[PDB]
Amino acid sequence: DPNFFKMVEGFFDRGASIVEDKLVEDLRTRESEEQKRNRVRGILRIIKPCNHVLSLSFPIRRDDGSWEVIEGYRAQHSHQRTPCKGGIRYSTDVSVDEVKALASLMTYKCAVVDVPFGGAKAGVKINPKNYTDNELEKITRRFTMELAKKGFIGPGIDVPAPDMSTGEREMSWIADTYASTIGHYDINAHACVTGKPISQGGIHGRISATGRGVFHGIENFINEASYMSILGMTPGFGDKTFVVQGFGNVGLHSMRYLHRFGAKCIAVGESDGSIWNPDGIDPKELEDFKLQHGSILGFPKAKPYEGSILEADCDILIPAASEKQLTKSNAPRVKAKIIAEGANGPTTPEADKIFLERNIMVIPDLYLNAGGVTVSYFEWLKNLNHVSYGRLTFKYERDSNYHLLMSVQESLERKFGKHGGTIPIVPTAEFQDRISGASEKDIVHSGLAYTMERSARQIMRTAMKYNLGLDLRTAAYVNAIEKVFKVYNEAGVTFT
Amino acid sequence: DPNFFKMVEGFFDRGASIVEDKLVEDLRTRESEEQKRNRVRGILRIIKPCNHVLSLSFPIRRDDGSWEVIEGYRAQHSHQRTPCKGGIRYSTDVSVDEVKALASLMTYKCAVVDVPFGGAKAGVKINPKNYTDNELEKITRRFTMELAKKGFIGPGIDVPAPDMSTGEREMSWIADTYASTIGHYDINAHACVTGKPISQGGIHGRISATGRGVFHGIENFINEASYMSILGMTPGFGDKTFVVQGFGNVGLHSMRYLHRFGAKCIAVGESDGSIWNPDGIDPKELEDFKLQHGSILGFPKAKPYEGSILEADCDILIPAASEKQLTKSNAPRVKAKIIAEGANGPTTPEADKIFLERNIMVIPDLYLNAGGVTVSYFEWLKNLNHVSYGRLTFKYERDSNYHLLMSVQESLERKFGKHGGTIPIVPTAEFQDRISGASEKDIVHSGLAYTMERSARQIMRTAMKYNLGLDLRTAAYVNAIEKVFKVYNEAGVTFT
Amino acid sequence: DPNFFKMVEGFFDRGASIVEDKLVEDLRTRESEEQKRNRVRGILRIIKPCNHVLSLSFPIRRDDGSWEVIEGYRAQHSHQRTPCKGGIRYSTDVSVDEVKALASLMTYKCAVVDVPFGGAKAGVKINPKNYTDNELEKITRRFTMELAKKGFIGPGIDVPAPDMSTGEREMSWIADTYASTIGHYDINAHACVTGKPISQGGIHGRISATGRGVFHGIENFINEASYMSILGMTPGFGDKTFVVQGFGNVGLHSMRYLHRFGAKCIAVGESDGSIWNPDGIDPKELEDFKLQHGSILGFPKAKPYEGSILEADCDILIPAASEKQLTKSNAPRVKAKIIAEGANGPTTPEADKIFLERNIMVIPDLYLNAGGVTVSYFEWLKNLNHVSYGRLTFKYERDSNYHLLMSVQESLERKFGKHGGTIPIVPTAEFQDRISGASEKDIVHSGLAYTMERSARQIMRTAMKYNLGLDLRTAAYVNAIEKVFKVYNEAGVTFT
């Protein structure tokens, strides 16, 4: 039951050693100078540790009038890619080593989904419950200030983001505080932080992002005969049956999209209890049940399962919640053949070894829930373009599409003595609804898909190159370390 | 006749009270702290008044050598949307109230056409006719300087624009003066002001912008069966017949585009006289007549009407000139069912109540002449993009289009033993032209059309929502207020 | 009675026309180009009107939770001298015209005392008595912010200052708000405003500044045989007898210092009533009386005089209170020969003419109460020096002094067989107190005295140059206009 930090770090060292060799021979061994290039692995030593970590201690006057000093910290893992990216966590269980760890994860994660951002992470030792909306605000802002004055929040330095503990409300404050203070003259002040309200410069499709990422991440592999054979998957009768642990944002959507495409949800577990039903569970029903009242407990059309759903018999198990939920203990008691990490670090290193032994394909957090980050990239861009995606092309494109059809029509009618006989100028029903309901989220969603696909293939190619089996995790880390390295390498350090 | 500031104010307060109640219940009553969220209407009382207004006296050495002080002002209504936008006036009738008023209009007008700009407006108590080109330049530059040193010109702060009293020449100077002085280090210096020459970073399709706007504005509503029924329009034999008051550069185009689509111009006024002809009047002909010599008076194919063509018997009357031309007096004497405000404030509040009483749909100036602004937004972006729209797509697109058609061809050929029989690969005449002559102005004009439309639906949906009839005006202002509010709300003021 | 604007403007014109002529002839008629140099009096036309004037409307959330919008303005008269200087007034009566006027006064006043600052002046339509300390703060800050973002509050742009309606507490806030936000990177952030607490970067000797100024102003003229003869003053039996109208800060000190040097206070009025006693009145007593309880009414050793002390028979009458207290009505009824304006505009133009008819010397407000400003200059400097005056010289000096004395002693003891006989190494009692209690205030107070004196002689010289009598006012303005002009002239405008 290791702890985040000594989990990630292992993962790195793992896929650091596996790259070192190859990373010298073949890649750069044709201009080998004193074969001391193997001492250039010092670039890997630099990548491992966070380059900067700022600890704070600011005060805020509670609503009752009493003073109080809040402590928090933000760590920036790497700068290989200028603008650092990472969330902000409001919890009373947020250690410097936790942030440092997550921040490390970020860099690699971003690499995997080709996002030009360095890994960061922030944490404020506070418990939102114990503060009033007004207080919270006061905190986020004073935080933003300090964070700014020391180069830890800037649209070209570090762009924060929400976490399970924080929301778009906070982000909106961060943004605004910044813009109305130290970034007053910055024409891209609002790009200092993402995950903010649409009105404040947010990007359409943020919410569903992470969730949709999980889906495409699974999709890409579930549709790869090769892998699906090693597991004896891509059925004919069974088709697809999954389970999701944690009905949060990510979990909910993950079950929405997964279900939409033929998969059947057999079990959903939460902090409270769980749910079971071989027949299937409908996303909207369970969603409206959890929105109408308390939790998911006492949901009709579903027997209350007891304990975690991590042992429910299904094909795909998606851990979209807490940390380290799959350990060396319950690792051999999992039915599922595929584990989709819809969260960070939901499986321990020991558990990984087991799963590998009994052919269990674990889709890396490092890649699966990199959907939010991918879209946050878009939000950043959308603030640099200062325009909502497709604002200037939708109409143009529409016209061009109708000209295309009209050309086929006129050109097919000139193969007959008519002037309105053939009727190609009519788009399909789907294609019509697309055109008529074109909107930013469509450009976003599509860009997401594209990235999750490209990345997927990339991981697969890397797992076939280093002969790995279903160890997609290390593959991904390796993939990442190779990218981060290349940047550093093709420059240096001080003589970079 | 009330003045411009009284009107606009009234309009605001009108919409402001309409919103208030719905703005609390339904749209935020779900987490209603001690229902004091009625006291949040303060937001509205912050939005109403301009938040800044700079008055300034600056000297210039007249050509003859003599010194003279020039006084002018610039008012920034709101900063809810960072870059303020507004035009510069050069008239000896300006008045700190006027600029405050028009700057108030701008904010709302931008909101309507989803343009991320705050409302601003400048004014220099001067009369261009009494100053040499050289002098005028001196002025516009000094003015830019002072305006810059105080934060009232700046690609991120405030982006000025031309008015009927200024031109691209001036704007060019403003842009250059700024980029050669204060904004020397700003990589977006030439985005400090719009409406500039092409060679100075201007955007194609500026001249026809406002005009085209008018058209689309009208078009969107004259295509809506619902509204066209309440009037008894969208006829089968009368089709469309319109009249334009003021043959300026908005009026002229308005006629051109209106006419080009099956509408017949039956009357065209001016500041001199008028024109009449139930058979119709050709735009080109009347244009060439005006351009070839003097005014439109003495135009063949047309009997010299006497008085204002605001009484002519037509379907659509488009006031594209002076201010307050439709008052309580002549309000009842109109024969047109639709009044398209191709100018600002061409109808008084009293007139509006009359037109409503005798079912007369008045398309708001707040929306109908927002075309120019909409495009100015594009110019700004163009300047930030550092590339002419389409530059890197036109060719790519072209290719992709041909491949599309080729596919349909080849594909269809397969259903026949021939390799050249069916020729879909040929684009319609129109489509060809479009492809061959693809320029920036096409992307621009299309983006415009897309904004006018979306905005038109938005206004309609708002009208229906607050069960407003043909009072599109208030409906628009309400629509605006709502937007501007949302921004403020989803943040605050100091604790924003 | 004419308002402040009308007056100050008149004063300017007056001096302006007196300087024009001479300002061309002997000054610069040697290079005389075209003799058009008269047309270079345009300079003057630029100097008269304020160059900028910002009007704002910013919100604050009152303690009760309600939301109000505060309106206020700042006006910068001239920039001829880089940092503008001027106070901030918190009263319901403030009017754009008022600030403009007072700003205008500053520029000239500073010129008189050789202070390198432009003339500025703020104003916030608000009555401090209606707001809680918290609320006041919240206003000063939000005001400082908006005032900064538009270039009306920086250490090198415009340095505000306290008024009778605002104190050091508000300044402190201004300073801090600025240095925490916009000016965060400015190493001289705390030089953005003056009149702030000592612990915030304030200079020692600010409270006795304006008062002491009034004293040295009077002292310099009451010591000039020439002027004192025209009035038959500098007596040998009557010595000195004065009267002060207004027992505010300036008035109190004025009496303290005046009295300390032989004068004899015979009457002191207030907003309530007055006091009279030919025998004399002791500052400390009357001070303690006021402090101890209520006003000055009921004070022992003094018969309650009814009305204004302006008519009390005395030598020097010092109006240290409200505006326009000496008009064309009571002007003839004055018994004093000298009128020391310890306030701004306490005598109307029409009163001035009268006093000049019956040889009454009126020492100009423009000069007399320029003591505060003079010291505020020091405070500014103090903040830019980053060290308290004397900090690194007191000790050194002390030592030097003793060595001086000990050199006289040893040297004198060498003219007599004795090593200890003569004792010149002993300072006087006064000297010793000075040495032992050396502190910043001393350096300040000295510098102030030096300025008031040099400025006094400058005024005189001017008066005698332009052959003005006891019309010290115009003489001062003229003296100012000359200075301001010289700057502009020895440069230009655009081609400056």
Side-chain angles (χ1 to χ4, degrees):
Chain A
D1 309 347
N3 60 295
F4 23 54
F5 127 80
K6 180 209 294 291
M7 196 140 104
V8 167
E9 279 220 357
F11 296 167
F12 176 67
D13 287 312
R14 232 276 201 54
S17 98
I18 312 171
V19 203
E20 181 185 2
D21 262 310
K22 281 292 180 305
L23 196 63
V24 184
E25 61 191 67
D26 253 42
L27 241 165
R28 58 180 17 286
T29 182
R30 269 185 279 199
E31 40 166 307
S32 47
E33 314 95 17
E34 228 323 287
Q35 268 303 60
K36 285 190 170 187
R37 309 306 59 180
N38 222 156
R39 197 186 283 164
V40 95
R41 61 171 183 171
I43 297 182
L44 292 176
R45 278 182 292 198
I46 292 168
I47 299 178
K48 186 180 184 184
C50 307
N51 305 322
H52 310 76
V53 47
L54 174 63
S55 304
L56 314 179
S57 69
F58 69 94
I60 71 129
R61 221 213 311 184
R62 265 186 180 290
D63 283 302
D64 69 61
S66 58
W67 265 265
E68 195 181 76
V69 302
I70 296 181
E71 59 176 298
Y73 351 81
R74 184 172 188 60
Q76 317 189 314
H77 186 63
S78 178
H79 289 67
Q80 106 252 187
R81 239 52 171 170
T82 306
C84 289
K85 197 74 185 61
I88 293 179
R89 190 172 169 183
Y90 282 2
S91 175
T92 347
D93 35 77
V94 281
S95 66
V96 181
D97 286 62
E98 193 196 64
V99 180
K100 291 238 303 297
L102 289 189
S104 182
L105 165 61
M106 254 292 119
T107 76
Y108 308 124
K109 171 179 297 179
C110 283
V112 185
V113 293
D114 291 311
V115 176
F117 282 157
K121 185 62 184 183
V124 175
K125 208 172 305 179
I126 239 63
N127 189 337
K129 304 306 192 66
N130 306 332
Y131 298 90
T132 49
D133 278 51
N134 190 288
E135 293 172 298
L136 282 184
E137 173 158 35
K138 301 246 299 177
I139 304 155
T140 65
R141 321 192 72 124
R142 304 187 192 205
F143 186 57
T144 296
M145 293 292 289
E146 310 305 315
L147 241 64
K149 296 164 175 277
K150 304 300 178 182
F152 272 86
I153 200 298
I157 305 180
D158 190 303
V159 185
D163 186 3
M164 305 307 265
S165 39
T166 55
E168 77 179 14
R169 318 171 305 161
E170 280 93 320
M171 261 45 231
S172 182
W173 297 330
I174 292 181
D176 176 289
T177 298
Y178 184 72
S180 294
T181 314
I182 322 299
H184 176 70
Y185 302 80
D186 193 345
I187 187 170
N188 314 298
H190 280 60
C192 73
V193 71
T194 80
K196 45 183 163 59
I198 304 301
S199 71
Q200 300 304 297
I203 190 171
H204 290 71
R206 166 195 48 267
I207 312 172
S208 64
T210 49
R212 204 166 301 230
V214 164
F215 167 92
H216 287 122
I218 302 177
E219 174 179 60
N220 293 308
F221 282 72
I222 206 67
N223 238 285
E224 274 293 281
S226 173
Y227 293 98
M228 289 302 93
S229 104
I230 308 303
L231 325 186
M233 296 275 78
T234 187
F237 178 62
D239 181 354
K240 311 172 195 306
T241 151
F242 71 106
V243 166
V244 55
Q245 178 258 303
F247 204 44
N249 181 75
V250 47
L252 164 51
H253 285 79
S254 293
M255 169 193 73
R256 246 276 300 299
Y257 305 124
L258 233 339
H259 175 280
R260 174 172 295 164
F261 283 57
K264 171 198 297 180
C265 183
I266 189 176
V268 175
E270 247 292 56
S271 314
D272 347 283
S274 300
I275 295 180
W276 158 275
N277 198 12
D279 294 45
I281 295 179
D282 183 64
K284 187 152 286 293
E285 286 184 353
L286 180 69
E287 205 182 314
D288 294 328
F289 175 93
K290 158 110 174 181
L291 224 299
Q292 200 123 54
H293 24 281
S295 185
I296 49 75
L297 296 60
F299 176 61
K301 332 156 178 291
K303 167 185 172 58
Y305 200 66
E306 193 147 303
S308 59
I309 55 292
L310 281 50
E311 295 182 0
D313 162 56
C314 58
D315 288 319
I316 337 165
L317 193 218
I318 76 167
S322 16
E323 206 171 63
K324 52 189 64 294
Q325 215 79 73
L326 298 177
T327 56
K328 182 176 180 178
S329 172
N330 69 177
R333 304 210 300 290
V334 291
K335 287 292 183 178
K337 308 274 293 187
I338 303 175
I339 296 183
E341 291 189 302
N344 303 293
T347 56
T348 79
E350 274 300 297
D352 237 291
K353 200 181 68 59
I354 282 66
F355 291 130
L356 229 64
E357 215 152 60
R358 62 204 224 80
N359 292 302
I360 298 287
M361 191 181 91
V362 185
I363 305 177
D365 68 88
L366 170 69
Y367 152 89
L368 202 58
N369 59 172
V373 190
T374 300
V375 177
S376 51
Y377 177 26
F378 299 172
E379 189 168 0
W380 192 59
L381 306 178
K382 176 194 176 186
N383 296 314
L384 303 193
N385 304 336
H386 285 264
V387 193
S388 53
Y389 282 145
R391 205 294 166 64
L392 299 162
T393 36
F394 283 166
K395 165 60 180 178
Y396 183 70
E397 244 290 300
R398 189 214 114 170
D399 292 358
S400 299
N401 282 170
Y402 281 110
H403 267 300
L404 218 56
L405 293 172
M406 254 307 292
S407 295
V408 162
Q409 168 159 292
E410 279 219 340
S411 299
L412 233 53
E413 293 184 0
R414 286 190 274 285
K415 181 207 62 56
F416 180 107
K418 210 140 186 298
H419 35 56
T422 326
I423 319 294
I425 66 173
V426 54
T428 61
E430 286 61 61
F431 188 32
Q432 171 58 45
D433 298 2
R434 170 192 182 70
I435 288 182
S436 62
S439 51
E440 191 180 67
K441 68 161 63 67
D442 293 310
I443 293 285
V444 174
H445 289 165
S446 276
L448 205 197
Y450 171 98
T451 293
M452 294 313 278
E453 188 194 311
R454 163 100 128 207
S455 293
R457 292 299 126 68
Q458 288 201 63
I459 285 178
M460 291 179 204
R461 293 157 190 163
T462 293
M464 271 165 50
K465 198 183 67 178
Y466 281 117
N467 221 178
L468 304 172
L470 281 5
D471 199 33
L472 277 21
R473 183 184 294 290
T474 57
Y477 276 103
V478 173
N479 196 64
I481 300 179
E482 221 190 313
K483 298 182 176 181
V484 177
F485 174 74
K486 185 177 296 298
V487 182
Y488 262 107
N489 177 214
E490 265 142 61
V493 269
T494 297
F495 323 76
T496 167
Chain B
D1 75 356
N3 51 301
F4 24 69
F5 187 65
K6 197 57 200 173
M7 277 189 275
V8 172
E9 234 225 17
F11 293 153
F12 180 81
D13 290 294
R14 213 286 184 55
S17 155
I18 301 177
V19 185
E20 178 166 343
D21 273 316
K22 243 300 178 301
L23 211 60
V24 185
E25 65 174 61
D26 307 317
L27 282 193
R28 122 171 300 207
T29 291
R30 5 152 149 164
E31 53 158 32
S32 59
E33 269 46 60
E34 207 101 20
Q35 272 280 312
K36 312 295 174 168
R37 291 203 171 182
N38 182 79
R39 238 174 189 177
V40 77
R41 67 202 263 186
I43 294 294
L44 286 71
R45 52 196 298 300
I46 304 179
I47 301 176
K48 180 184 170 189
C50 300
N51 308 313
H52 294 292
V53 52
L54 157 58
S55 339
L56 35 75
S57 110
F58 55 86
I60 68 163
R61 280 237 289 185
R62 281 178 127 292
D63 287 43
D64 68 63
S66 77
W67 256 283
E68 168 184 349
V69 293
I70 302 177
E71 58 185 4
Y73 342 77
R74 173 75 182 184
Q76 307 183 308
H77 186 84
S78 177
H79 301 183
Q80 107 267 187
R81 220 62 115 177
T82 316
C84 286
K85 202 70 181 63
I88 303 176
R89 167 102 68 193
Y90 275 31
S91 186
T92 25
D93 297 326
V94 300
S95 54
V96 188
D97 297 80
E98 187 155 64
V99 294
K100 273 182 58 182
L102 301 183
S104 184
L105 188 67
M106 254 294 229
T107 59
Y108 305 122
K109 179 181 290 180
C110 278
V112 188
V113 292
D114 301 273
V115 182
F117 288 150
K121 179 70 176 185
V124 179
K125 198 65 173 297
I126 219 67
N127 188 302
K129 291 280 195 59
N130 301 310
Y131 299 85
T132 152
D133 271 26
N134 202 212
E135 267 165 42
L136 274 180
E137 179 170 356
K138 285 182 177 179
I139 306 179
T140 64
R141 311 181 81 81
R142 194 64 29 56
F143 186 55
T144 291
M145 288 291 251
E146 310 302 321
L147 218 55
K149 297 177 183 177
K150 309 300 177 182
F152 283 63
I153 207 304
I157 306 174
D158 193 8
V159 178
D163 186 57
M164 295 305 238
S165 41
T166 62
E168 80 182 14
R169 286 194 313 175
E170 285 94 305
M171 268 54 250
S172 177
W173 296 322
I174 293 185
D176 171 281
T177 279
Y178 185 78
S180 292
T181 298
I182 304 299
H184 172 64
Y185 306 91
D186 191 356
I187 162 180
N188 298 287
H190 289 64
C192 71
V193 64
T194 79
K196 47 183 183 296
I198 287 299
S199 59
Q200 300 298 302
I203 188 176
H204 295 81
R206 180 188 68 235
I207 313 175
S208 52
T210 315
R212 289 157 169 284
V214 188
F215 178 96
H216 290 89
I218 304 177
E219 188 232 314
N220 259 300
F221 285 73
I222 210 172
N223 261 185
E224 204 63 326
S226 305
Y227 299 58
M228 290 291 90
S229 300
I230 301 303
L231 327 185
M233 302 300 101
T234 183
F237 205 62
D239 175 279
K240 314 168 194 302
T241 59
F242 68 109
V243 176
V244 61
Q245 210 286 301
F247 204 100
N249 222 61
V250 40
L252 161 61
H253 290 67
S254 294
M255 199 181 119
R256 190 198 306 302
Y257 298 102
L258 252 315
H259 163 288
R260 179 172 300 166
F261 275 78
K264 261 179 177 176
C265 177
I266 186 175
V268 183
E270 256 207 310
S271 59
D272 308 296
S274 292
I275 288 179
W276 170 278
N277 188 286
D279 289 7
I281 313 174
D282 183 74
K284 193 91 276 289
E285 281 195 357
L286 195 54
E287 185 192 311
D288 287 294
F289 197 72
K290 164 81 174 186
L291 202 291
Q292 181 179 59
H293 57 57
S295 69
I296 53 73
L297 287 54
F299 168 60
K301 292 187 176 184
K303 153 63 180 180
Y305 178 72
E306 173 73 342
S308 181
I309 63 296
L310 247 46
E311 251 58 298
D313 191 54
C314 63
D315 293 3
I316 301 180
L317 196 219
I318 65 173
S322 302
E323 263 193 56
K324 40 213 171 186
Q325 251 68 208
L326 296 166
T327 69
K328 195 177 196 61
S329 302
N330 49 184
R333 299 133 66 178
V334 300
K335 312 303 177 182
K337 313 307 297 180
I338 308 177
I339 292 184
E341 293 186 297
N344 288 184
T347 76
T348 67
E350 310 289 294
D352 268 289
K353 296 179 67 176
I354 278 58
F355 295 127
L356 235 64
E357 280 150 46
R358 46 205 242 66
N359 292 295
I360 293 301
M361 194 179 95
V362 174
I363 297 170
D365 51 351
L366 181 69
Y367 156 99
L368 194 67
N369 121 127
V373 186
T374 301
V375 182
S376 70
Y377 172 14
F378 298 1
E379 171 161 349
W380 183 61
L381 292 175
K382 165 168 185 170
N383 307 297
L384 287 185
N385 293 151
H386 288 289
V387 210
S388 74
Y389 285 119
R391 218 312 205 312
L392 290 72
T393 96
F394 284 169
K395 166 62 179 180
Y396 180 79
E397 172 199 305
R398 191 203 76 77
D399 292 351
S400 234
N401 283 173
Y402 277 90
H403 276 300
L404 246 289
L405 281 179
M406 240 314 282
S407 285
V408 181
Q409 165 164 291
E410 220 186 66
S411 297
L412 246 59
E413 284 177 353
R414 242 194 308 300
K415 192 213 67 176
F416 171 22
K418 195 69 216 305
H419 334 56
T422 305
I423 61 294
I425 59 176
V426 57
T428 67
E430 300 54 54
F431 192 18
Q432 177 53 70
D433 288 354
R434 181 224 194 67
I435 300 168
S436 297
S439 45
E440 187 185 71
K441 57 190 188 63
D442 294 309
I443 298 292
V444 182
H445 290 159
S446 68
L448 196 191
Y450 177 83
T451 297
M452 295 312 295
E453 169 177 350
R454 196 146 77 80
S455 299
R457 281 234 74 72
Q458 296 182 305
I459 290 181
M460 282 184 209
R461 204 147 286 145
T462 311
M464 285 171 59
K465 174 183 179 180
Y466 289 127
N467 267 57
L468 303 152
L470 291 62
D471 199 308
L472 290 59
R473 187 186 289 290
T474 56
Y477 283 99
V478 174
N479 178 54
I481 309 302
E482 263 202 297
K483 293 181 178 181
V484 182
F485 175 88
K486 185 174 297 178
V487 183
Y488 277 103
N489 183 185
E490 264 146 50
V493 282
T494 28
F495 282 169
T496 163
Chain C
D1 61 63
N3 48 291
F4 33 55
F5 190 67
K6 305 290 184 300
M7 289 194 274
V8 185
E9 191 182 309
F11 295 158
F12 178 75
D13 295 310
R14 214 287 175 61
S17 152
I18 302 178
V19 183
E20 169 172 352
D21 253 284
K22 295 291 182 181
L23 204 56
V24 178
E25 50 187 64
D26 77 358
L27 197 182
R28 73 177 34 263
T29 216
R30 254 59 82 281
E31 70 178 63
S32 160
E33 265 87 41
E34 276 274 322
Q35 186 46 50
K36 279 187 175 185
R37 321 286 270 166
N38 200 76
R39 280 189 172 183
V40 89
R41 62 161 160 172
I43 298 280
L44 286 83
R45 282 181 292 182
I46 304 168
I47 303 180
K48 191 176 181 183
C50 293
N51 310 316
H52 305 278
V53 62
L54 181 73
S55 319
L56 325 90
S57 308
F58 64 89
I60 63 156
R61 192 171 183 181
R62 298 174 131 300
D63 281 37
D64 64 69
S66 59
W67 252 289
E68 177 188 353
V69 264
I70 288 66
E71 60 185 63
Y73 10 76
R74 177 85 177 188
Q76 319 204 316
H77 184 73
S78 168
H79 287 71
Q80 130 240 188
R81 226 58 162 174
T82 55
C84 297
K85 197 71 190 62
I88 302 180
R89 199 158 105 186
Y90 283 179
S91 190
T92 295
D93 67 349
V94 299
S95 51
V96 164
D97 254 355
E98 164 181 316
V99 292
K100 306 216 315 94
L102 295 170
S104 176
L105 178 74
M106 273 306 276
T107 44
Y108 303 130
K109 180 182 293 182
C110 280
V112 177
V113 291
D114 304 286
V115 167
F117 298 157
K121 192 68 183 59
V124 184
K125 291 198 72 173
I126 158 193
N127 197 289
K129 289 185 172 187
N130 300 32
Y131 299 78
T132 133
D133 279 44
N134 258 263
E135 298 181 314
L136 285 182
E137 192 183 73
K138 239 184 293 184
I139 294 185
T140 59
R141 323 199 84 109
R142 303 194 191 195
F143 176 62
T144 291
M145 290 295 256
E146 308 301 314
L147 212 68
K149 302 185 176 182
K150 301 300 179 187
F152 271 74
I153 204 177
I157 312 75
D158 181 8
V159 175
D163 201 58
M164 287 282 291
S165 50
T166 35
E168 55 183 295
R169 49 160 174 161
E170 291 112 299
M171 264 40 231
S172 171
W173 297 329
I174 300 179
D176 170 286
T177 283
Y178 182 85
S180 298
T181 303
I182 310 301
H184 177 60
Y185 293 86
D186 193 347
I187 182 176
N188 311 295
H190 296 79
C192 60
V193 65
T194 46
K196 53 192 177 301
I198 298 302
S199 66
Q200 292 301 303
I203 187 176
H204 279 57
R206 172 180 62 278
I207 331 78
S208 52
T210 317
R212 213 160 301 210
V214 177
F215 163 84
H216 294 93
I218 303 175
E219 167 177 49
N220 271 292
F221 285 79
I222 201 73
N223 283 158
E224 186 60 61
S226 306
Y227 286 127
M228 287 296 81
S229 290
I230 306 300
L231 318 180
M233 288 282 95
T234 196
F237 208 85
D239 191 3
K240 317 165 189 303
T241 59
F242 69 99
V243 177
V244 56
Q245 211 303 300
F247 203 44
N249 172 61
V250 52
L252 166 46
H253 293 65
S254 220
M255 174 178 75
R256 208 224 302 300
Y257 305 118
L258 243 300
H259 175 297
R260 177 186 302 179
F261 277 107
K264 185 166 55 188
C265 181
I266 189 176
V268 180
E270 274 199 304
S271 61
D272 325 306
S274 304
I275 288 182
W276 158 282
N277 182 303
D279 312 352
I281 305 176
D282 191 79
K284 191 61 198 302
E285 291 203 8
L286 180 55
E287 182 197 311
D288 290 316
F289 196 69
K290 187 178 183 181
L291 311 192
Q292 196 171 63
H293 65 72
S295 60
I296 65 176
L297 279 76
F299 173 56
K301 285 181 170 184
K303 191 95 298 179
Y305 187 95
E306 274 191 292
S308 43
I309 58 288
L310 290 58
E311 231 132 299
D313 183 60
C314 52
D315 272 354
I316 313 171
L317 183 258
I318 66 176
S322 53
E323 244 173 55
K324 299 173 276 289
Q325 211 115 64
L326 284 177
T327 57
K328 173 182 178 178
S329 185
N330 49 176
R333 282 124 56 179
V334 299
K335 318 309 175 185
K337 265 284 189 172
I338 287 177
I339 308 177
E341 297 183 302
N344 292 297
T347 62
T348 75
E350 292 295 294
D352 269 298
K353 183 193 175 187
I354 277 57
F355 289 111
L356 189 143
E357 204 242 63
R358 40 196 266 78
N359 293 307
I360 293 298
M361 184 187 82
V362 166
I363 317 180
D365 54 347
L366 177 69
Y367 160 81
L368 210 54
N369 70 166
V373 189
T374 296
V375 176
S376 69
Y377 171 43
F378 300 171
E379 166 164 347
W380 188 61
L381 300 166
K382 178 182 181 176
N383 300 322
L384 293 188
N385 301 335
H386 288 290
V387 198
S388 31
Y389 284 86
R391 217 310 200 314
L392 298 69
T393 40
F394 278 171
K395 186 72 169 62
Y396 190 99
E397 169 183 297
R398 200 254 63 171
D399 299 349
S400 262
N401 290 178
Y402 281 35
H403 287 217
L404 250 314
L405 304 183
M406 243 309 263
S407 295
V408 169
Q409 175 162 293
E410 301 211 308
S411 295
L412 240 43
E413 289 177 354
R414 301 235 290 293
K415 183 190 54 48
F416 178 18
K418 193 81 143 296
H419 48 179
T422 321
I423 327 286
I425 57 179
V426 58
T428 72
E430 305 71 69
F431 193 17
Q432 182 51 63
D433 286 358
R434 179 264 200 52
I435 293 181
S436 196
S439 55
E440 201 177 69
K441 47 149 61 180
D442 308 315
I443 304 294
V444 181
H445 286 161
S446 73
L448 183 276
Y450 171 96
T451 300
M452 298 305 302
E453 166 180 49
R454 193 163 67 177
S455 296
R457 291 293 136 60
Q458 284 180 52
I459 294 179
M460 288 173 207
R461 225 165 294 178
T462 292
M464 192 174 83
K465 172 179 182 179
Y466 292 111
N467 209 63
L468 314 179
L470 288 44
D471 188 29
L472 277 31
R473 198 190 297 287
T474 63
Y477 277 96
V478 175
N479 184 56
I481 311 301
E482 283 186 299
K483 299 181 179 178
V484 167
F485 178 77
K486 196 171 297 178
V487 171
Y488 267 103
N489 196 183
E490 263 127 58
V493 277
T494 311
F495 282 163
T496 168

